[PDB]
Design a protein around this ligand. Structure first.
Ligand code: FES
Ligand SMILES: [K+]
Ligand SMILES: [K+]
Ligand SMILES: [K+]
Ligand SMILES: [K+]
Ligand SMILES: [Mg+2]
Ligand SMILES: [Mg+2]
Ligand SMILES: [Mg+2]
Ligand SMILES: [Mg+2]
Ligand SMILES: [Mg+2]
Ligand SMILES: [Mg+2]
Ligand SMILES: [Mg+2]
Ligand SMILES: [Mg+2]
Ligand SMILES: [Mg+2]
Ligand SMILES: [Mg+2]
Ligand SMILES: [Mg+2]
Ligand SMILES: [Mg+2]
Ligand SMILES: [Mg+2]
Ligand SMILES: [Mg+2]
Ligand SMILES: [Mg+2]
Ligand SMILES: [Mg+2]
Ligand SMILES: [Mg+2]
Ligand SMILES: [Mg+2]
Ligand SMILES: [Mg+2]
Ligand SMILES: [Mg+2]
Lengths: 232, 108, 164, 115
RNA sequence: AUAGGUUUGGUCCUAGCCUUUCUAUUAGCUCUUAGUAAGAUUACACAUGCAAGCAUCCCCGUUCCAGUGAGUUCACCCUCUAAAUCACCACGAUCAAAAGGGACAAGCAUCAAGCACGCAGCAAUGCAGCUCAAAACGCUUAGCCUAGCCACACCCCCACGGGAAACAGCAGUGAUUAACCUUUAGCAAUAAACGAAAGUUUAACUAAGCUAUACUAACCCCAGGGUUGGUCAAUUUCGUGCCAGCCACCGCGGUCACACGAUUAACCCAAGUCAAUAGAAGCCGGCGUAAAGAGUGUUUUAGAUCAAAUAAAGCUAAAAAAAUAGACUACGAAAGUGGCUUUAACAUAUCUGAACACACAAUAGCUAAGACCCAAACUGGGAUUAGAUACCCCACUAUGCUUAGCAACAGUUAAAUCAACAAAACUGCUCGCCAGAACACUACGAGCCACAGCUUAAAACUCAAA
């Protein structure tokens, strides 16, 4: 099977990580190549690993031979694993806007069946993590290492519903249009519950993105948005 | 810029697109005035077959003749399309093979 | 991001959240308010948040604002008859001011629903025409009727080429 | 647009495709094109029998009465349709054509008997 | 945009160009059938035949329909009110002109002033006003806001008159363009005209003819076009050897060429393919080092919420400019201000906001005069190697001198500090400026001056970078 292109290393699987000197096996982990570069000769490889159940990581490996670089990167990646929280084990808990160096990433939580409409590297990393429904937009410099670092950083700093309930001492109630006006309580505080309601902010002072508002108002006209694509 | 500045300046005004050697037309008819060869710019070496043609618009222009072997002579009628010849600076018109006097490339 | 504080004010959805539709009598609304003083705070918010919505829902009403011309904020409405309505707005929040003006000079929900029902009659579902105005272009789109010859050829007996 | 004189008339505007006619009953200025600008659409008429063997005619009777009361004229096909609907009296020519067809069929029957 | 390729020895940033998607036209090659839709490049010139009649004479119609896109804010709403239809006694509805009010495309400010563009009075006449950097006035471009609308109808905007003899009605032709439908039939349906009516007429229209332009459905045998180095799916064997040739971008070709030609195989689409052209998709981003914020202060229509100075008089010690004080850091808008005395005297109770107004500032050079100890650009003379010393010495000019003149503001240190280096990061608000390189501190226009000029500031060609 080919990667992102016929002649591209990116997206290619390297197989499970080798059994570690600690004695752990990683047969449930898959490895993917994100970047291969000639260092002036040696090779620097950026790879990502993940078990598809929230545990995922990435690493750089430098070696004169490509296979040695792959092995080094994979083995070092398995020992630097992030755990990524997933809402209902298919998507993220909330929208995440981040900037790592000069790379900006906007991530949007999506319902089931939406799929991965993301940068191809983000699609690979999401498949490794176990995220199945998400939207992502990458802006600024498209630098692969910065993209990976920013993605992992933002995904590792997402607040779960239980965390929000404990912080605010209130019920987190979900409203679904497909479920009508039925209130679904997704999280309740473990401790006592505050009896005073949250201030009913008549107009919140949030920082909006012109991109989202322009799309919502129908003034987006891009011929490249919402194109039909293969299942991801 | 501030919102007041954006309001005063208004929407961006994209400059009009520049018309090319064909003047925004798919093809152009032309009369061959003379045939000659030109040398590429130098990472490359060759003798590119070119012809000067008076177009239907009245302008005289240099065009490249693609393929191996041509039988174009003076006073012959050709059809020229767009497309730059990357090796030849200033040559932005290409003769269409198999139209009017310019015949298709002979096999082998 | 969108420039300025409270960029949500510059979204059509917020602008359409407005619930004050003035009766046809109202021609001009002047808003006299003060830039400093706690007792005028709500009035300041009324200028910041609700005047855009009121103007959006009432495009033909002339809204004008005045600053630090009187010790107290107030609203004045000029009616077509020549009457003037004064609304004092000290100690009142912006929401309270909106409710007050809605009550005294705003069309009620019954009148608005009547207007929408009148608008509905203009687009008769039985008419056939372009998509911009009608649900269907032609009767052939109705099942049981003869469909387009473009999609289903007619039998030779119904074509003039075979009748002439 | 200002036309020299003219009047409103309720008539049939032809749409559909080749060998598949369909009609819209519209009130329009008589000088306007057949399928052009109109004042109001007052109904429709499908002259091809449907799967149930019916010719479907929709008539906005309230608006038809309104426009007749505002001075609108009627084309002969529209008068015949309204006569068939029972809204108007049967047009004299429906009766006369029926009588002519009766006489023609009588002549054909007499020819058959003579043979 | 879910993006991708391409600057370097290398990494990062910025930035252009191109790739992938969807349409339309034209071109090459190819092409079986059926239905449907659509169909001159040209406001250039037109052979020929038709496109308006009806009706007991009057009238009515031929002011419509049909056509084109040359010109171009007469199209929309409100007020008023003709003509028209029906009421037909109008009452009044419907429809809709002329007139009044409002609204109404794009580019260019190197189009910044227009030049009578207003008001009041019954009039006589009086006032001097009116539009405009929130874009007047002007030049250029374009049919538009598509159930359709506007404008035009050979030209002179118009059409008494003149040029002159009219297809922008249908079919058709010549010329021209890359652009190329039949010199068919019928009024059977609908629409229009006329008639009291049976009815009559209609190149509107209906039904056909031609055309891969498109959509739909097929097919009994019947497939072509492009592509195969990366982006980007997919090469075997020969030929050639920086030649012939090829490429959208990066690039290939010098005897093992997956990149040229042939051949084999494969890949994509498919009655099409896809070469050219043109559209579809563009700034809520930035301004120390990449394009873009270093003279100073005041006013300014509006917007915001942050309401040891200086000048003038005198005087002076060490030897005209002022040791110590001054290890002080004060005064002023900045430039700058450091001997002593005296007289005047150091704007403003919010902030932002002039190229165009007024003040300063520093910068050297000219115009009248005057002084001239000394110094000294230039100009002469003296001495010197073997193109002397450009350089040393002497003399003397202009001049040195003295008058008289020409990013700002207000908050925060909470966050993950943060491309890099600079100078730790950010917020709010306002103004100015910037959208690849070079052409170009340029040309032209305008303003100001005027020996040299200063401010504003383009376009063509070229490139894949900078
Ligand atoms: S649109 Fe009605 S027959 Fe085709
Ligand atoms: K008559
Ligand atoms: K036009
Ligand atoms: K004219
Ligand atoms: K007929
Ligand atoms: Mg490949
Ligand atoms: Mg790029
Ligand atoms: Mg073709
Ligand atoms: Mg016609
Ligand atoms: Mg009248
Ligand atoms: Mg009018
Ligand atoms: Mg035009
Ligand atoms: Mg003509
Ligand atoms: Mg004329
Ligand atoms: Mg013709
Ligand atoms: Mg054509
Ligand atoms: Mg035709
Ligand atoms: Mg005929
Ligand atoms: Mg036809
Ligand atoms: Mg080859
Ligand atoms: Mg710079
Ligand atoms: Mg100020
Ligand atoms: Mg400033
Ligand atoms: Mg200059
Ligand atoms: Mg100029």
């Amino acid at each position: 099977e080919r990667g992102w292109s016929g002649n591209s290393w990116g997206g290619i699987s390297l197989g499970p990580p080798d059994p570690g000197p600690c004695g752990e096996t990683y047969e449930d982990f898959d490895t993917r190549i994100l970047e291969v570069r000639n260092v002036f000769k040696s090779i620097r490889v950026l790879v990502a690993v993940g078990n598809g159940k929230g545990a995922a990581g990435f690493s750089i490996g430098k070696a004169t031979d490509r296979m040695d670089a792959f092995r080094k990167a994979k083995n070092r990646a398995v020992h630097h694993l992030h755990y990524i929280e997933r809402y209902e084990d298919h998507t993220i808990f909330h929208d995440i806007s981040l900037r790592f160096k000069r790379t900006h990433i906007k991530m949007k939580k999506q319902p089931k069946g939406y799929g991965l409409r993301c940068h191809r590297a983000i699609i690979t990393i999401c498949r490794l993590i176990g995220i199945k429904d998400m939207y992502a937009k990458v802006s600024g410099s498209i630098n692969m290492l910065s993209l990976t670092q920013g993605l992992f950083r933002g995904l590792s700093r997402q607040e779960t519903h239980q965390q929000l309930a404990d912080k605010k001492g209130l019920h987190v109630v979900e409203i679904r249009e497909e479920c009508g006006p039925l209130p679904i309580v997704v999280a309740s505080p473990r401790g006592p519950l505050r009896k005073d309601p949250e201030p009913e902010d008549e107009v919140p002072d949030v920082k909006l993105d012109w991109e989202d508002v322009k799309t919502a108002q129908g003034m987006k006209r891009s011929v490249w948005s919402n194109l039909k694509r293969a299942a991801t | 810029a501030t919102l007041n500045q954006m309001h005063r300046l208004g929407p961006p005004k994209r400059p009009p697109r520049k018309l090319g050697p064909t003047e925004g037309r798919p093809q152009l008819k032309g009369v061959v005035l003379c045939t000659f060869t030109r040398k590429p710019k130098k990472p490359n070496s060759a003798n590119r077959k070119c012809c000067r043609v008076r177009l239907s618009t009245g302008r005289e222009a240099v065009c490249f003749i693609p393929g191996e072997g041509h039988t174009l002579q003076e006073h012959q009628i050709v059809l020229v399309e767009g497309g730059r010849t990357q090796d030849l600076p200033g040559v932005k018109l290409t003769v269409v093979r198999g139209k009017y006097d310019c015949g298709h490339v002979q096999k082998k | 991001p969108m420039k300025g504080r409270f960029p949500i004010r510059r979204t059509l959805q917020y602008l359409s959240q407005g619930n004050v539709v003035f009766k046809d009598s109202v021609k001009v609304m002047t808003v006299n308010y003060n830039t400093h003083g706690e007792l005028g705070e709500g009035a300041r918010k009324f200028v910041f948040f609700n005047i855009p919505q009121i103007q959006y829902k009432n495009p033909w009403v002339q809204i004008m604002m005045f600053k630090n011309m009187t010790p107290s904020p107030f609203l004045r409405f000029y009616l077509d008859s020549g009457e003037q309505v004064l609304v004092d707005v000290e100690t009142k929040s912006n929401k309270e001011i909106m409710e007050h003006i809605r009550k005294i000079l705003g069309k009620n929900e019954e009148t608005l629903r009547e207007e929408e029902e009148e608008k509905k009659q203009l687009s008769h579902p039985a008419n056939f025409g372009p998509r911009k105005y009608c649900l269907r272009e032609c009767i052939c789109e109705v099942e049981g009727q003869v469909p387009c010859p473009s999609l289903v050829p007619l039998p030779k007996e119904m074509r003039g080429k075979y009748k002439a | 647009k200002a036309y020299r004189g003219g009047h409103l008339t309720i008539r049939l505007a032809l749409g559909g495709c080749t060998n598949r006619p369909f009609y819209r009953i519209v009130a329009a200025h008589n000088k306007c094109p057949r399928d052009g600008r109109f004042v109001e659409q007052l109904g429709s008429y499908d002259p091809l029998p449907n799967s149930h063997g019916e010719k479907l005619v929709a008539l906005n009777l309230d608006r038809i009465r309104h426009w007749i009361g505002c001075g609108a004229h009627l084309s002969k096909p529209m008068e015949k349709l309204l006569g068939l609907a029972g809204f108007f009296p049967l047009h004299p020519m429906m009766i006369t054509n029926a009588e002519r067809l009766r006489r023609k069929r009588a002549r054909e029957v007499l020819l058959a008997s003579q043979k």
